Amino acid sequence: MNGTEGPNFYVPFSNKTGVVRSPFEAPQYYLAEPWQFSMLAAYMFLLIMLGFPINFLTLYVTVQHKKLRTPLNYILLNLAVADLFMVFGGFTTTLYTSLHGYFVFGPTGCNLEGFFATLGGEIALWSLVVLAIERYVVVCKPMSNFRFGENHAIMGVAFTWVMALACAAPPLVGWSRYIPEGMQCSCGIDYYTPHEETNNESFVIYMFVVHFIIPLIVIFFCYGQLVFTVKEAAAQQQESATTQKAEKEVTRMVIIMVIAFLICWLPYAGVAFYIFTHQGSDFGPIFMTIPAFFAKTSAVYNPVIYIMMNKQFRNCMVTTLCCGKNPLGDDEASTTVSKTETSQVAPA
Amino acid sequence: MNGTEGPNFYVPFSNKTGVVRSPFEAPQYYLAEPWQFSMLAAYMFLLIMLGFPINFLTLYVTVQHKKLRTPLNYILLNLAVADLFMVFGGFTTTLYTSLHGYFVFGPTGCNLEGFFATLGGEIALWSLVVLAIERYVVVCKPMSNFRFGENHAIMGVAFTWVMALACAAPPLVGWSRYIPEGMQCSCGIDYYTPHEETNNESFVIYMFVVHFIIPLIVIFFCYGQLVFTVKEAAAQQQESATTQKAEKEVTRMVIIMVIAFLICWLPYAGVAFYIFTHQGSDFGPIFMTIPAFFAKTSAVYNPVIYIMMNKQFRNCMVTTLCCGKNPLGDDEASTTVSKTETSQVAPA
Numbered sequence: 111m112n113g114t115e116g117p118n119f120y121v122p123f124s125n126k127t128g129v130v131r132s133p134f135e136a137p138q139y140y141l142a143e144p145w146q147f148s149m150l151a152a153y154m155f156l157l158i159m160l161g162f163p164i165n166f167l168t169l170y171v172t173v174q175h176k177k178l179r180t181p182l183n184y185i186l187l188n189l190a191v192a193d194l195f196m197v198f199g200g201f202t203t204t205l206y207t208s209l210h211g212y213f214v215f216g217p218t219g220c221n222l223e224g225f226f227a228t229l230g231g232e233i234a235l236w237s238l239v240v241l242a243i244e245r246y247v248v249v250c251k252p253m254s255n256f257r258f259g260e261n262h263a264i265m266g267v268a269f270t271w272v273m274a275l276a277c278a279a280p281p282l283v284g285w286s287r288y289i290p291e292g293m294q295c296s297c298g299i300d301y302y303t304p305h306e307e308t309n310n311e312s313f314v315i316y317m318f319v320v321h322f323i324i325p326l327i328v329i330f331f332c333y334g335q336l337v338f339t340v341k342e343a344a345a346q347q348q349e350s351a352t353t354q355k356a357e358k359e360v361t362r363m364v365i366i367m368v369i370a371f372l373i374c375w376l377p378y379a380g381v382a383f384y385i386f387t388h389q390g391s392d393f394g395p396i397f398m399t400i401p402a403f404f405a406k407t408s409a410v411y412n413p414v415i416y417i418m419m420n421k422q423f424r425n426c427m428v429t430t431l432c433c434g435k436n437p438l439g440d441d442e443a444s445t446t447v448s449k450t451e452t453s454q455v456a457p458a
Numbered sequence: 459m460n461g462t463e464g465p466n467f468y469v470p471f472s473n474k475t476g477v478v479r480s481p482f483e484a485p486q487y488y489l490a491e492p493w494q495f496s497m498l499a500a501y502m503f504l505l506i507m508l509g510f511p512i513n514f515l516t517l518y519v520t521v522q523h524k525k526l527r528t529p530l531n532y533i534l535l536n537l538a539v540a541d542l543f544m545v546f547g548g549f550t551t552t553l554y555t556s557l558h559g560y561f562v563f564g565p566t567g568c569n570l571e572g573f574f575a576t577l578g579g580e581i582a583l584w585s586l587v588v589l590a591i592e593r594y595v596v597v598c599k600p601m602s603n604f605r606f607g608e609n610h611a612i613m614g615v616a617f618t619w620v621m622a623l624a625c626a627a628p629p630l631v632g633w634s635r636y637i638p639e640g641m642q643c644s645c646g647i648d649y650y651t652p653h654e655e656t657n658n659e660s661f662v663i664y665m666f667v668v669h670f671i672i673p674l675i676v677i678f679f680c681y682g683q684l685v686f687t688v689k690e691a692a693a694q695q696q697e698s699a700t701t702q703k704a705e706k707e708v709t710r711m712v713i714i715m716v717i718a719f720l721i722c723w724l725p726y727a728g729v730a731f732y733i734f735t736h737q738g739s740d741f742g743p744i745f746m747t748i749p750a751f752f753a754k755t756s757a758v759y760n761p762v763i764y765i766m767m768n769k770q771f772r773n774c775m776v777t778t779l780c781c782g783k784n785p786l787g788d789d790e791a792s793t794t795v796s797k798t799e800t801s802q803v804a805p806a
């Protein structure tokens with residue numbers, strides 16, 4: 111047998127030499143060099159020491175600042191809140207495991223690492239649709255006087271906070287199970303085994319379409335509608351109104367965010383799709399570790415985006431960090447506001 | 459001429475098109491694309507966001523835990539400080555410099571953006587010698603009844619602070635000078651021009667020898683000593699005493715800590731050396747930017763190593779972070795330390 115299936119796991123290592131042991135009961139150093147595990151352990155650390163201050167940062171700002179209440183603004187708060195969970199929710203454990211060399215918390219732990227990770231990523235994928243929608247509703251405006259209010263925004267927050275939930279939820283209650291991958295440090299869905307007990311079989315097809323293929327379309331498609339309308343080409347202050355040229359930046363951002371997704375996941379979705387269609391092939395632990403751990407940057411490449419492609423936010427952020435005011439720079443140029451300082455509304 | 463020497467600088471760009479401007483008076487966007495500076499800018503931000511908590515933490519931790527008082531718990535405590543100094547020291551500036559495309563604070567900026575760096579950079583180097591020796595004195599144990607006291611650790615500290623100071627402070631008072639390098643976002647010593655009025659020539663030698671090659675001897679050699687004695691080959695509980703065992707851990711580390719140095723500084727020291735031995739050839743802004751900005755990771759790659767190759771420190775940290783205690787993990791299986799908990803004195 112190429113790998114070693116346990117009733118709880120599947121080590122991508124042959125037990126010909128009888129050296130394989132449950133990733134729930136002992137270090138997996140026989141899978142790779144111990145310094146290699148120290149490697150994963152640091153990586154995560156950085157992630158935790160980074161993705162934390164930054165995402166927290168975000169929350170605390172949006173909260174404080176009163177004008178930051180646009181769709182985009184509502185989506186990116188979520189993301190920050192989802193990511194705050196991955197980190198404290200599961201990234202922390204992955205570190206634990208890494209620092210030990212195996213899931214010491216056994217299955218409860220893998221159910222953490224797995225759950226959160228899955229959810230947070232699904233949410234990120236879904237949020238990328240609640241967006242395509244809006245982007246379409248503002249660029250191709252199929253309406254007359256319909257505006258995407260904060261109310262429609264909180265809807266998505268629920269929509270996504272649920273759709274992505276009915277994804278990382280089942281493997282915790284009979285439908286599918288979470289199982290360690292690569293060097294047994296990370297946890298994911300079970301692609302490796304058929305395990306009729308939980309029909310890992312059905313659950314995987316359910317997600318390769320209803321939680322991937324579909325959202326992929328929905329987004330790519332909407333990206334087609336705004337092909338003739340707003341494009342990448344966006345001139346200086348205004349293009350048919352600075353309001354029309356300011357929306358083309360919320361759009362030149364969203365695109366990128368999506369890229370940052372199909373780079374953070376396809377490399378993995380591909381690996382996971384190859385292992386499913388070949389549940390037994392001769393693949394090694396390094397095979398799924400790299401594409402998997404790489405996808406964990408997911409918890410950080412979003413605020414960076416938004417903090418570089420959102421004059422509004424970025425300015426409003428430095429205002430928060432410079433304690434008092436000192437907007438310096440060249441302000442948002444357009445709207446600005448905060449908790450009280452420049453929070454003054456000037457709408458209609 | 460291949461570059462544009464100014465009375466205060468040296469832009470690695472030809473002024474044949476008369477487009478070159480003082481990096482103390484105008485943006486250097488003609489040297490590279492404006493988004494690249496944005497990169498440096500973005501990057502600089504990630505460094506500060508990570509390096510602060512990580513270094514601040516380490517500080518408050520070494521202080522609260524009354525037993526973390528080994529020479530190592532001194533050299534790194536002093537090492538984390540030297541980094542906080544770089545971070546707020548010149549890291550802040552340099553970001554501000556990348557943000558506005560040029561050294562707005564003129565030379566003043568260049569001097570801090572360049573001092574502190576040279577400062578801490580050296581301390582981390584010297585801090586490695588003050589570690590190599592100590593490692594020698596315990597592994598090849600030169601005395602028959604010697605042991606470094608807290609006083610000695612403070613001597614090293616005072617020492618590395620003198621040695622490093624003895625080379626970062628001179629360029630502030632007439633011997634050589636800090637001049638911006640690469641894209642003109644960072645400052646360093648002058649290898650570029652001979653400037654007789656300041657003696658760049660002489661200094662640069664005094665640095666490549668009395669502060670690099672020689673310390674690079676006092677260390678590698680010392681290692682060739684702990685080759686026959688304590689070796690990277692570290693087993694489990696006890697080696698000839700669980701004491702001798704854990705002695706091996708503090709070494710596998712120092713070694714790594716020395717790797718994480720030659721990695722972070724040779725690529726730069728190399729570039730720096732080539733230029734010197736070619737004060738006038740043709741090289742571009744990117745040339746020294748890369749080695750240079752990568753070297754700045756020196757402000758973090760230490761605590762991460764420490765907090766990973768030190769079960770006791772890691773645990774004291776988990777103990778601290780988990781507000782109360784409950785060091786979960788695996789503890790150190792050996793000694794522990796803190797303030798009111800189990801910082802209980804347990805000698806002989």
Ligand SMILES: *[C@@H]1O[C@H](CO)[C@@H](O[C@@H]2O[C@H](CO)[C@@H](O[C@@H]3O[C@H](CO)[C@@H](O)[C@H](O[C@@H]4O[C@H](CO)[C@@H](O)[C@H](O)[C@@H]4O)[C@@H]3O)[C@H](O)[C@H]2NC(C)=O)[C@H](O)[C@H]1NC(C)=O
Pocket residue numbers: 114116125127128129130131132
């Ligand atoms: C790969 O191939 C190996 C060689 O064929 C095979 O080896 C067997 O490994 C199992 C454990 O994985 C060994 O059984 C253990 O024996 C010890 C006695 O030294 C027991 O303590 C242990 O159970 C304990 O139960 C306690 C109560 O629950 C608990 O407190 C303890 O912590 C512990 O769980 C097991 O009984 C067995 O002797 C090995 N046999 C041989 C031939 O060496 C590997 O299992 C196999 N690995 C795979 C398939 O993943």
Ligand SMILES: *[C@@H]1O[C@H](CO)[C@@H](O[C@@H]2O[C@H](CO)[C@@H](O[C@H]3O[C@H](CO)[C@@H](O)[C@H](O)[C@@H]3O)[C@H](O)[C@H]2NC(C)=O)[C@H](O)[C@H]1NC(C)=O
Pocket residue numbers: 462463464473475476477478479480
């Ligand atoms: C590269 O070649 C450029 C053209 O030779 C040259 O431009 C010159 O720059 C100086 C700036 O110091 C200008 O001088 C001005 O100085 C002050 C301004 O505050 C005033 O006395 C005057 O306005 C004065 O013009 C020169 O006018 C300008 N000459 C030009 C454009 O022809 C750059 O300085 C060169 N880059 C270098 C060597 O750093």
Ligand SMILES: *[C@@H]1O[C@H](CO)[C@@H](O[C@@H]2O[C@H](CO)[C@@H](O)[C@H](O)[C@H]2NC(C)=O)[C@H](O)[C@H]1NC(C)=O
Pocket residue numbers: 111112113390391392393
């Ligand atoms: C163990 O792994 C090997 C390598 O992946 C598997 O061998 C492949 O089997 C398929 C179908 O039988 C062939 O089409 C491939 O050509 C084989 N690969 C090669 C070239 O070696 C093998 O089937 C696996 N055995 C188990 C445990 O199922």
Ligand SMILES: *[C@@H]1O[C@H](CO)[C@@H](O[C@@H]2O[C@H](CO)[C@@H](O)[C@H](O)[C@H]2NC(C)=O)[C@H](O)[C@H]1NC(C)=O
Pocket residue numbers: 459460461738739740741
């Ligand atoms: C400008 O740079 C070029 C290339 O970096 C220099 O040309 C080199 O000159 C040295 C002698 O100083 C020769 O050994 C090399 O073979 C030359 N290479 C090339 C590409 O010609 C040139 O000297 C520099 N000009 C100055 C002096 O500023």
Ligand SMILES: *C/C=C(C)/C=C/C=C(C)/C=C/C1=C(C)CCCC1(C)C
Pocket residue numbers: 227228231232235296297298299317318321322375379382402403406
């Ligand atoms: C370290 C974290 C890991 C390996 C996280 C695992 C996350 C999942 C199993 C997520 C799954 C999917 C998506 C995010 C997009 C849609 C398709 C899935 C089901 C492969």
Ligand SMILES: *C/C=C(C)/C=C/C=C(C)/C=C/C1=C(C)CCCC1(C)C
Pocket residue numbers: 572575576579580583639644645646647665666669670727730750751754
């Ligand atoms: C962004 C930070 C920078 C450019 C830091 C600059 C640091 C130096 C100029 C350091 C120089 C050297 C050492 C630390 C060791 C000894 C040899 C030198 C002179 C190349």
Ligand SMILES: CCCCCCCS[C@@H]1O[C@H](CO)[C@@H](O)[C@H](O)[C@H]1O
Pocket residue numbers: 144145146148149152707710714762763766767768
């Ligand atoms: C971030 C620096 C850590 C990554 C470099 C690996 C260095 S090495 C690694 O260190 C572990 C802890 O001491 C040991 O248990 C293990 O045997 C050893 O190979």
Ligand SMILES: CCCCCCCS[C@@H]1O[C@H](CO)[C@@H](O)[C@H](O)[C@H]1O
Pocket residue numbers: 376377378380381384391392393394397
């Ligand atoms: C976008 C990245 C998608 C990656 C999917 C390509 C899987 S490629 C697959 O890997 C196996 C295990 O190493 C090999 O044994 C096999 O020969 C190779 O073709």
Ligand SMILES: CCCCCCCS[C@@H]1O[C@H](CO)[C@@H](O)[C@H](O)[C@H]1O
Pocket residue numbers: 421424425428431438439440441503557558
């Ligand atoms: C201290 C927070 C670091 C985040 C970096 C934000 C850079 S912000 C940038 O600054 C330029 C000049 O100062 C302005 O002209 C521009 O409008 C502003 O958006």
Ligand SMILES: CCCCCCCS[C@@H]1O[C@H](CO)[C@@H](O)[C@H](O)[C@H]1O
Pocket residue numbers: 724725726727728729732740741742745
């Ligand atoms: C790892 C230490 C790095 C050693 C530094 C190597 C400097 S090498 C130098 O780089 C110039 C770039 O403009 C080239 O034009 C030139 O031909 C090349 O020899």
Ligand SMILES: [Hg+2]
Pocket residue numbers: 241242243245246329331332333334336
């Ligand atoms: Hg779209």
Ligand SMILES: [Hg+2]
Pocket residue numbers: 370371373374375405407408411
């Ligand atoms: Hg990514």
Ligand SMILES: [Hg+2]
Pocket residue numbers: 175425426427429446447448
């Ligand atoms: Hg604001």
Ligand SMILES: [Hg+2]
Pocket residue numbers: 590591593594677680681682684
């Ligand atoms: Hg040594």
Ligand SMILES: [Hg+2]
Pocket residue numbers: 718719721722723752753755756759
């Ligand atoms: Hg480094």
Ligand SMILES: [Hg+2]
Pocket residue numbers: 770771773774775777793794795796
């Ligand atoms: Hg401790």
